[PDB]
Each structure stands twice: as C-alpha cells, then as structure tokens.
Design an enzyme around this catalytic site. Structure first.
Site, PDB file in Angstrom:
ATOM      1  CB  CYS A  58     -12.867 -35.900  12.564  1.00  0.00           C
ATOM      2  SG  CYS A  58     -13.770 -36.895  11.303  1.00  0.00           S
ATOM      3  CG  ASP A  65     -17.076 -38.311  11.568  1.00  0.00           C
ATOM      4  OD1 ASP A  65     -18.053 -38.379  10.487  1.00  0.00           O
ATOM      5  OD2 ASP A  65     -16.376 -39.148  11.542  1.00  0.00           O
ATOM      6  NE  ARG A 123     -20.612 -38.982  16.396  1.00  0.00           N
ATOM      7  CZ  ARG A 123     -21.773 -38.737  16.137  1.00  0.00           C
ATOM      8  NH1 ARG A 123     -22.185 -37.902  14.894  1.00  0.00           N
ATOM      9  NH2 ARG A 123     -22.732 -39.455  16.792  1.00  0.00           N
ATOM     10  CG  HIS A 177     -14.105 -38.804  16.539  1.00  0.00           C
ATOM     11  ND1 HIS A 177     -14.950 -39.908  16.288  1.00  0.00           N
ATOM     12  CD2 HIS A 177     -13.787 -37.929  15.455  1.00  0.00           C
ATOM     13  CE1 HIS A 177     -15.389 -39.642  14.882  1.00  0.00           C
ATOM     14  NE2 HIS A 177     -14.796 -38.507  14.521  1.00  0.00           N
ATOM     15  CB  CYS A 231     -13.280 -42.093  13.208  1.00  0.00           C
ATOM     16  SG  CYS A 231     -13.023 -40.769  11.947  1.00  0.00           S
TER      17      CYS A 231
HETATM   18 ZN   LIG Z   1     -14.247 -38.846  12.357  1.00  0.00          ZN
END
Ligand SMILES: [Zn+2]
Ligand SMILES: [Zn+2]
Ligand SMILES: [Zn+2]
Ligand SMILES: [Zn+2]
Lengths: 220, 219, 219, 215
Positions: free
Chosen positions: B42, B44, B46, B98, B101
């Site tokens: 993703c 994102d 993280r 994850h 999200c």
């Molecule tokens: Zn995500």
C-alpha cells in the site's frame, strides 16, 4: 519455498525483538497518522526512500512503477497523486530516479520483452525527443543522461496534470521535486525542475533542459 | 521549503558519514543486481517492506498503489508483474496489506473524494461480494476484515492474470503470497492464499475465504 | 425523456419495417460473423465508418475514443487490437481521423476541461514535437494539420506495440493504415504511414512526416 | 492488398456520387455539430448505432470496446464520459449490448487468448456475482443472460463513477440507459436499469436484477 520461510523468520525475529524491547517504533508511527510527502520512485528500489531521507516512520506516501513514470493517462499513478493532494493534503511530491536503471536500460535495449515494452515506449519517446543531444554523448554516458532527462520530463508531466493544476489554481500549497541519486553515492541530486505553480513549472523545466544540454568534455 | 531543505539535509549527512565511514552499503547493494522478490504493498507504507523482511539491500522489486491492488486491467501494476516475471525471472510475488489502512477507510466512507473514488470502487465491489459476512461483523471491526479479504482477492486477481498463468504453463517457477500485518506490532500474517499453479490458487483461495468467513463473537 | 423516447420510437419503426419488408439485412449480417478490418476512429463519429466504406454489415470491428488515439499504455485500445489481431486474425487495422475534430480543438485550446485534458496531453506532446512546422503554418490551418499529424503518429504508436510487432515476427499478415477525411466531402485521404512490417513502418512514417513538412506558399 | 483498394474505390464512388449528384448530407451534418447522446457499444458493432436509431447525422458521440464495458479504472472510457458530460453537456448515456457477442463468448470460454483475457476478467467477476442464476442455465442460454446482465452492471458502474455522481450533485440533467438487441431483428430491449440520480440508480438496478432472475 525456502526463501519465504526465511523471510517470515526474519520478520518474526525483528517483530518479537521489538515487542520484548518495549520499543516505541509502533508508537511513533501511530503518531504520524498522516504523511507529508509523496514519493514516486522506481520499482528497482535500490536505495529505499526511508534510508535516503531518514524521515520518521509514517511520513512518506509512496508509489513505485518501472522507471518512475507519470504517464498522462495512468489511472494508477494519477489516483495516488489525487488522493495525496486532495485528501491527505500533503504539500510535497518528489519524483526520484536512479543511475543504472533496469527500466531505462530496457527502454534503450532493442529487444522485445513483452508487455513491459509498451510501458517503456514512453521512455523511448523521451529518448527520440532528446535524440540530437543524447547522440552527442558517449555510449557509456547515454544511460545515466536519459535517467536524468526522464526525471525532468516526469516532473513536467506531473505538473501538467489536471490534479496538480486545479490544486495550484485553488491556491492550495503544493510543490513538485525531481531528483536523482547514484547507487554508489546515495546523495540526492536535484535535476532542475521544481514547481509551486504552473509558471515556475514552465520556467524551471525550460532551464533544467537547457542546462542538461550543456555537455562536459567527458562526452564525445 | 522548510521540510524539503531539512530532508536534503538528513540525506547529505547520512550519505556523507557513509563515505567517510568506508561503509560497504553501496558496495554490497551493488552485489545484488537482480531482485528475487516482488513486493506489492500500500502507498500508505506504514512499516517499510525492508524493515518487515529485513532482507538484503536491493533484493526487493516494488510496486505500491492505494490499498495494494492488482486490478485486472491496470497497465501500471501488470507491467511491473510482467517485467518481474518474464524478464527478472523473480519467483516470488507478495501482496501485503495492513491494518488501519486509509485506502480501505476511504473505500468504506460515503464521501466522494474525487478521482480516487473510481480506483476504490474495486474495493467496494469486494465489500459487496462479502456483504453478508461484513454485515454480521461489528462496525469498528469491518475495516480490518475488509483489509484482509482485500489481500485474498488481490492474490486471486494476480493468479488470474495471463502473465502469471502463462508463466506457470511454460514451466516457470513462481509462487504468489498474500499477507497482512497489524500496524501496532508489525507481525506478517498469512491470509491463506498461496499459489504455485492455477490449481493451488483455486484451492487455497476457496479455503482462505472459507476460513475468513468464520466469525468469533468478538466480531 | 423526449430525445430518448424518440430514439426508441425510431428504433421500433425501423425494426418493424425490416420485418414487414421481409428484409434480408439480418440474415446477411449473420453471414459475416468475423470482421476483416479493425477501424479505430474518433468518438465524434461525424461520418460513420460504414457510410465512408460502404462495406457489408459486420465486416468492421470498431473502437472509438477521443481523437482516435492509440496510447502506448491504454489497456482498452490495446485489448481491442490484440483481440482483433491474435483472435480474430484481422489483417487490416485502420486509424481514421477527421477535420474539425473536437478532440483536436480541445487539445490546442488553453482551457483545462478536467479529466479529458490528461487524455489530450498526448496530443499536446505531438503538437509541441511538430511545433516548428505548425507555427510556420497559418493559424486557421493548424488544426487540420495537427489532425493529419496525429493520425500519422497514432499509426506509428500502433506499429510499435508489442502486439503488432509479435504478429509480424511470427509471420502473420497484417497491414496498418492512417487516413483522414474532410467533414465537408467525405473523401478518405491516405496520410502516408502504411506498414506491413516494422521496416515499412519506419520508412513510411519518416516519409509521411517529411511530406507533411513540405508546405506550399499558402500556409 | 486488394481489400483496401476496393475499400478506397468504394469511398470515392460514394463521395463522388454525393458531390456531383449534389447532396446536402455534409451540410446537414455540419448543422448538427454537437451530439445529444453518448453511445457505448461493443467493438463487434453488428448493427450500427446509426442504423438502430435512425438518427440525424452527427447526433451520436460514440465509444466502443470489447463487450461494451465501463470499467471503474479505464482512462479511455471515463475520458469519453467526462468529456461528453462536462464538456458537450450530453444528457443521455446509452450502454448497448447485443446477442451473440464475441466478447461475452470469449469471457465464458476457458481458453487463454492473451491480453484480452485480462480485459474480460471483469465479465467473469460479473458472471460469478450472478453465479446462482447463471448456473441454472446451459452454456448456450447462459451467454444470452450474461449479455443482458453485463449491460445492467455496466450501467451500474457508469452511474457510480465520480464523473456521473458529480454531474448529478451539481444538478446537471443526465440519464443512463442499458439496452440490448438481438442481432436477428434489431429491436432495442430495455434491460431495466435507467438512472437520473444515484437513488434511482440503486432502485432500478435492484429491481432489474430481480426481474432478470425470474426464469
Ligand atoms: Zn493502506
Ligand atoms: Zn529503476
Ligand atoms: Zn474527432
Ligand atoms: Zn459484442
């Protein structure tokens, strides 16, 4: 497979290490619920962005594709950009290329590799665009030059998207950056294009390309 | 800008204390010219894949999009897959989702967020395909459940591409993985779909969905 | 509503007439199950491909998008091309542009129309690429010229797809064509790019762009 | 190759005829500069949209792809839609399917035809979505039903695009239609999904699926 078993092992190891370590990595990360930079790089991912910027966890929003491109009509990349700008409200988008790029090499290679060639035809149009110039260079140099020009052209494509323009237009704060690092150095090197508006996009792009065209004696 | 100059700062520093430390980082990294794993995660991002796998520098080929998707007709992602498989001969492809999200959350929100909404409609279709299950789930629990089902469906989509099927068919070794990790602990958990052929894809996919459909009263 | 109701009414009247006329149209259409030409035209569809060619019903496999483009990474158009070539075994693919094209005018325009601008950015890159030639041309004549150049460039993109090249490589018979017609007379005019191999693609493309660059004293 | 020569010969014949025989076809065409309908049909193009609707020349803005799809993330189709709606101000979008569609047949066949297979995976997802109904049919009758359902789903996808929803939200007039015609008679048959807002999209879609599921 074997590699996968090990991979999972490495993860469990690191994962528990932290747990018992009462580390704060998962706490710090959870405090940076929102990124402040969008990073557009190559899938080769030689030197990670987290490594190059030493930023705190959760600070980056990333997108990676072959040869770090921003194609006018790529729904995938455009969606990451639009979500970053219009929803996350992040104010900086960085496009980062890198020397010795497989994408770039494949683009220049006169060989049919399948589906990927179509994706790389965009790089080849950029190639023929700066043909005269690139032709003035030395063979062992052309690769890295294209890598640098490519990044210039992508920043330019990015700034010409309806997404970025409309952002600028409504007065939203947003800047575009285009760097290139050498796999041996790790030092991010700005390529010239850096926009905060469409005017600055046009100016820096024109200059950035003009400067790239001034070849050192190194190249024939 | 303050954030940019500061970023360039952190870099020259790190890269410098690397040259004046004779570090072999850029030396070792150079030894790994070809990656052996394709990671589809993703945007994102993280917990970095590098930190999750703790693998060797330069071993991962990576693609990232909002909500780590493998859309049937996405030229971008399919190009990454095809290049990795047909050209780099990578034998392992991992799709990693994850918890907590944003893409997943945005997909579930009613608000029209713009262009990104069209991209997330694929997630919403996945939601409806598992509407009974997700409905029986508790409100603040759905997001994470959809996050897991999404990974299962993406490995399924990946195994159905002509690129992967043709790879298997012509006798090329290749496995597909679909995992998810909680942002709070970083533990990679297998969602059940793992494929080394079209047949194993079908079986593990049916089983994975079957298992994910078993809800504990903890909803 | 009005427009829709009328259309439906028109349809009913037509189909009835055909049935009462004991027309053979449909049976003849059924005779031409597989098309022999793939026509890529503009969504403007000023003069239908059927009228321009007077071909028998069902002989055309069609694709239309704004400004008859063949973008390198467009899954929609490439799917059509690969299906027509690898599956239908069509041997003729024809790209056709037209004068007074809304997509061309919009590309040259300065107003940001939204999503469509991105699609048209490909045409603008073609506009800059040939800026010298176009600028050296009469303003009121530039649109017609860009329309002709666009076609030559699209044929060049088509001939460079992994799809078309592989077909030539394996010895499949396949020729590409690029034409334009004036909305005022309906005459199809060959733009010069015509290939049956990548060799003929390069040559015809070069010659085409060169020819288009030889302007007469009338801008 | 001969085929092309014959094609060019025909064009000239027709165009020439139009001129000397002095026709106002182009003049009338020129009069209808802006289209009033967006027609999304299949690349199979069995019975031309112009022949089915018998409309005035220039009234249709057209998009065609394999199996007349409106995929959520297709830049090609969404650009046609956004341009038609936001720029040309068209108020009716029509998705038209047809019996004996090669796109539908290839999606159902268990053959690997290449790149096109990825495009058709969206049809297969639709097939699975209605697997209960479709599974009660023979392969033959399943094709005809999937053809009709595909259209209802595409209309549903179209009405869910950010482009269409925004048009409705700012009060622009816009209707969506999903029809199918048998290639043996050419009669346009409404599949039931007709939308002029997001609410009517939901209701008519649910209602249409309900009707189609009655055997
Ligand atoms: Zn995500
Ligand atoms: Zn690279
Ligand atoms: Zn046009
Ligand atoms: Zn069809």
């Amino acid at each position: 497979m074997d590699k996968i078993k090990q991979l999972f092992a490495n993860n469990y190891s690191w994962a528990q290490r932290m747990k018992e370590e009462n580390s704060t990595y998962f706490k710090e990360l959870a405090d940076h619920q929102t990124p402040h930079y969008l990073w557009i790089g190559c899938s080769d991912s030689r030197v990670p962005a987290e490594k190059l910027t030493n930023l705190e966890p959760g600070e980056l929003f990333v997108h990676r594709n072959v040869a770090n491109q921003v194609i006018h009509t790529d729904f995938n990349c455009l969606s990451v950009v639009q979500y970053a700008v219009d929803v996350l409200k992040i104010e900086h988008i960085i496009i980062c290329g890198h020397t010795n790029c497989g994408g770039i090499h494949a683009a220049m290679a006169d060989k049919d590799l399948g589906l990927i060639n179509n994706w790389l035809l965009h790089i080849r149009d950029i190639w023929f665009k700066h043909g005269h110039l690139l032709g003035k260079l030395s063979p062992e140099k052309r690769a890295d030059m294209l890598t640098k020009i490519n990044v210039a052209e992508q920043v330019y494509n990015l700034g010409r998207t309806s997404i970025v323009k409309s952002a600028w237009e409504r007065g939203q704060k947003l800047s575009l950056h285009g760097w290139v690092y050498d796999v041996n150095d790790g030092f991010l090197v700005d390529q010239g294009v850096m926009a905060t508006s469409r005017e600055t996009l046009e100016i820096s792009y024109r200059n950035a390309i003009a400067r790239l065209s001034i070849l050192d004696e190194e190249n024939i």
